[PDB]
Amino acid sequence: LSFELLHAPATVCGPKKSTNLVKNKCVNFNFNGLKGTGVLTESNKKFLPFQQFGRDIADTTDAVRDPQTLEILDITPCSFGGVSVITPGTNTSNQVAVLY
């Protein structure tokens, strides 16, 4: 058995496509090159067979279909946002409260 090293366009690549799938959790997926974070949620919107990944008004991947399974999953980001702290003056007291 002998091979060729970078003498032609590549044809025989090894399988590097992760191991399993994750549901109901925001983890970093890699859908054949595109990388994104979100929660895979079932979608009631009908998907045409040729379509692979969706696009929102932000031009980001919000919908996708499985490369093998015919099922379709929506990308919804998990809990995120700014946090604000309310407090009185330091001379009066030091009690604080959290607010999202």
């Binding site: 932000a58 980001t60 980001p77 946002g81 700014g82």
Partner: peptide
């Protein structure tokens, strides 16, 4: 709300967020 204000209200229709007014 008086119907004038109701008509006026009816005639008006990723990090970024909208703060509700006080």
């Amino acid at each position: 709300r008086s119907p004038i204000e109701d008509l006026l209200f009816n005639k008006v229709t990723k990090g970024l967020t909208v703060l509700p007014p006080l």
